[PDB]
Write a protein that binds this ligand. Structure first.
Ligand code: NA
Length: 129
């Protein structure tokens, strides 16, 4: 599923991402925009042989099992395919563990390089929330 900006913001808000560990909704929408272009089905293989999955491009090295990332962990206790669902519940729940892991949203390289230190609340402008 390719979400709308406001459609995704609403779904993120409902699932408790707004101001989660201090990160406004605009930080999450910006991240999803630059990680996946709001596509739940997005996959990107990494040179370490891990893969990034879904709307927030969660990595198979630590967070989910895809059956082909050797010596990887599965800290969100989920198959990576779950992160590709049109329902973002598993992506949101897993993102809450990630952002709680010590480095905040710096865990998302596209957030650090394209959202952090920008006017992120721009990403929810015009949205009924
Ligand atoms: Na894994």
């Amino acid at each position: 599923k390719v979400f709308g900006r406001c459609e995704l913001a609403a779904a993120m808000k409902r699932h408790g991402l707004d101001n989660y560990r201090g990160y406004s909704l605009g930080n999450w929408v910006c991240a999803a925009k630059f990680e996946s272009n709001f596509n739940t089905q997005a996959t990107n293989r990494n040179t370490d042989g891990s893969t990034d999955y879904g709307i927030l491009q969660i990595n198979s090295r630590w967070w989910c099992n895809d059956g082909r990332t050797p010596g990887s962990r599965n800290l969100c206790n989920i198959p990576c395919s779950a992160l590709l669902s049109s329902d973002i519940t598993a992506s949101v729940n897993c993102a809450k563990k990630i952002v709680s892991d010590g480095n905040g949203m710096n865990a998302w390289v596209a957030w650090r390089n394209r959202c952090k230190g920008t006017d992120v609340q721009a990403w929810i402008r015009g949205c009924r929330l």
